[PDB]
Ligand binder design. Structure first.
Ligand code: NAG
Lengths: 101, 49
């Protein structure tokens, strides 16, 4: 998943879109004092997964598209438009981001 | 029981929240969590009568 927020742990507001393989969970944690909870199925599913995350007027719009990739070195030269998946009215800053490994 | 925020370092974006409570730097000397000269708390309580 990806962690969004101004700081790393505390003192501001943070975001958590952590996920695993069996159940595709989009459990949005707004602990930092829970103020927003949401969960639904579709977030995920030699392949290239292209994503767009936006934050405009407190709306978190997430695009997703799966495309098979051949010769995975560098980037492909082609066209594959992304489709809208999940809209979230979280209403926070989203200053920086960190990818969960 | 009602409080409002009057001190900030920037202006709010539309549809967003700010519940952080740290002492505002109104001068040059650091507050370090202690109020005093040029260091004011951002949450002022209402006085409705
Ligand atoms: C987030 O806060 C910073 C200052 O801490 C400010 O510069 C920035 O504009 C804010 N962004 C949003 C989307 O409110």
């Amino acid at each position: 998943g990806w962690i969004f927020g101004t700081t790393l742990d505390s003192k501001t507001q943070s975001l958590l879109i952590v996920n695993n393989a069996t159940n595709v969970v989009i459990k949005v944690c707004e602990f930092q004092n829970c103020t927003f909870e949401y969960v639904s199925q579709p977030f995920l599913m030699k392949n290239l997964r292209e994503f767009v995350f936006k934050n405009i007027d407190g709306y978190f719009k997430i695009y997703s598209k799966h495309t098979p990739i051949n010769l995975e070195r560098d980037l492909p030269q082609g066209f594959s438009a992304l489709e809208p998946l999940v809209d979230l009215p979280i209403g926070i800053n989203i200053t920086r981001f960190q990818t969960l490994l | 029981n009602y409080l409002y925020r009057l001190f900030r370092k920037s202006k709010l974006k539309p549809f967003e929240r700010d519940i952080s409570t740290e002492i505002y730097q109104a001068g040059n000397r650091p507050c370090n969590g202690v109020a005093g000269p040029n260091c004011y708390s951002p949450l002022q309580s209402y006085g409705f009568r």
